[PDB]
Amino acid sequence: YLVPNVIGGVFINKQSVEKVGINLVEKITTWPKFRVVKPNSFTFSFSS
């Protein structure tokens, strides 16, 4: 039965503590990464 006010989105811990989470940006990049190490030296790092 739907409680008519609660929206939820939390986790109950082992000590009855409500835990809530944020979204996180991934470390793996969908475009390759450009870098300049020293001048006239360039780096193009990608992942699969």
Next chain:
Amino acid sequence: DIRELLSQYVDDANLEDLIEWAMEKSSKYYIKNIGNTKSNTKFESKNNIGIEYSKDSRNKLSYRNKPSIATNLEYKTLCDMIKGTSGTEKEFLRYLLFGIKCIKKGVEYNIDKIKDVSYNDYFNVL
């Protein structure tokens, strides 16, 4: 003594004007060798490649490579302008040679009297 060569090359009607312009613009714009080492911000990358190419010393020769493919065969004041002239009269002869090429082309040899394109007729609203 250069009036012999300069009357060989052009008329004596715009001649000492050419001489005084070449003299003062050669003594004004004289350029030495200034610096550019890598022990001392960024331009456009198309020019920055050449700039940080020229920053290092191993890309330059120890002595000057003299030119080989012979140019300026109509105007052979270069035959003395290679190494008989190295001080102020070298750049003086270079400037008057450019002036002779401009006046035989039949166009203005100076750059100061090439007057500016005044751009504040496009940006003078309100």
